[PDB]
């Protein structure tokens, strides 16, 4: 069980399991990637008191990766509440992460948080102005907002 | 027709969350745990992005529904032996209602079975201290101490 792992071993395991999730992700095996990313993150339960610089940095990197990929997975599965949760977790540890703002915007938009989504997408577009996929989502958000406001 | 979260007023978010929570409770009593989990999560989804609410009446109702849904989810996940999810939900209750005894207990159980033994001992010792004649808490505390003594060998 988790009892048997040193802090260093927890970070190594989370990294290995995240890589396993990446492999499922690349093969379009989304449900299995989700399981692996959550398994990786479970190694960091009750680690808020860590103070080792290196463990903290590795933890941050792994948590960003796992939560970003979860957000993508959940958008693919059309589970917008879960995508919102995981994208938001990225932003808590890496403010203005462009990928997370984008995924959050898309999930917010499809769930119906239209004003929130337009803020997210505006921010992502303004940090990454030469991305057409952001523009397409931003277009849809504006259309939805216009239509909802005239209704 | 409600097609997205856009279509709900704050009052309606509270009402729907309460109603959906009750649907969860109905599944729970029928031992339809997976079905109950879905409903409790749907209830909580009504409160996404409501941090800046300031209507005290709605806040108080939201708080009660959030405590109930998260407590019930912790129970569901302990039943399904999904201990990380139970840890998450019991911990959410505690963020809202510090030293909620039921949440401390459910957090202790989930910690214990997942292997967070020292953590579990603290949760359960605290819970037993608050409710010293509760046998459910006592038995879980004894199991925790048994596990921890074994683990240390």
């Amino acid at each position: 069980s988790i009892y048997d792992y040193t802090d260093e071993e927890k970070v190594q395991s989370a990294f290995d399991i995240k890589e396993e999730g990446n492999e499922f992700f690349k093969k379009n095996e989304i449900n299995e990637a989700i399981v692996k990313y959550k398994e990786a993150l479970d190694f960091f339960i009750h680690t808020e008191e860590w103070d080792d610089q290196i463990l903290l940095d590795k933890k941050k990197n792994i948590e960003i990766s796992c939560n970003l990929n979860l957000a993508t997975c959940y958008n693919k599965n059309k589970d917008y509440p879960k995508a919102i949760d995981h994208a938001s977790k990225v932003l808590k540890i890496d403010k203005n992460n462009v990928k997370a703002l984008y995924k959050l915007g898309v999930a917010n938009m499809y769930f119906g948080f239209l004003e929130e989504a337009k803020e997210n997408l505006y921010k992502a577009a303004s940090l990454n102005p030469n991305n057409l996929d952001i523009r397409n989502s931003y277009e849809l958000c504006v259309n939805k907002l216009k239509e909802a406001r005239k209704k």
Side-chain angles (χ1 to χ4, degrees), chain A:
Chain A
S1 73
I2 198 68
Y3 187 86
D4 297 314
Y5 291 79
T6 67
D7 293 352
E8 296 281 339
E9 282 168 344
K10 292 180 181 188
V11 172
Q12 295 176 26
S13 288
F15 176 79
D16 290 348
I17 295 171
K18 186 265 304 184
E19 298 280 281
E20 289 173 12
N22 282 358
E23 290 302 311
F24 285 110
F25 187 90
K26 272 76 208 168
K27 284 179 158 72
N28 214 351
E29 295 174 86
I30 302 308
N31 289 335
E32 196 42 57
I34 290 172
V35 168
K36 292 288 168 273
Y37 294 127
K38 289 193 160 182
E39 285 177 350
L41 289 171
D42 290 340
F43 280 92
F44 299 130
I45 294 170
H46 307 321
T47 62
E48 80 173 61
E49 302 190 332
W50 278 14
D51 68 337
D52 184 288
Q53 288 208 129
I54 297 315
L55 289 176
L56 289 176
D57 195 67
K58 299 177 167 170
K59 177 177 160 182
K60 186 176 166 169
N61 288 346
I62 297 158
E63 288 190 329
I64 294 173
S65 293
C66 284
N67 284 297
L68 278 175
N69 296 339
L70 281 169
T72 306
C73 288
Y74 284 130
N75 282 341
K76 283 173 184 272
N77 282 357
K78 303 181 184 192
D79 193 331
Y80 304 118
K82 293 192 187 56
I84 293 164
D85 177 60
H86 290 287
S88 291
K89 287 170 171 161
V90 174
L91 294 165
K92 263 86 178 185
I93 61 185
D94 188 16
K95 50 176 190 69
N96 305 129
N97 179 290
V98 187
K99 289 183 188 98
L101 284 160
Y102 177 59
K103 297 169 202 299
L104 177 59
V106 171
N108 273 333
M109 166 174 70
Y110 286 131
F111 205 66
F113 292 115
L114 303 178
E115 291 182 23
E116 292 85 353
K118 196 170 72 166
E119 296 180 27
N120 309 145
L121 293 167
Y122 170 76
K123 291 173 178 270
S126 300
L127 299 169
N128 203 327
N130 311 308
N131 181 315
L132 290 202
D133 303 307
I134 297 171
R135 188 175 180 279
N136 297 333
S137 295
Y138 195 171
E139 289 271 10
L140 183 57
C141 193
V142 170
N143 281 11
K144 285 171 168 286
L145 198 42
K146 287 183 170 182
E147 286 145 22
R149 286 215 260 243
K150 95 102 168 77
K151 195 263 146 60

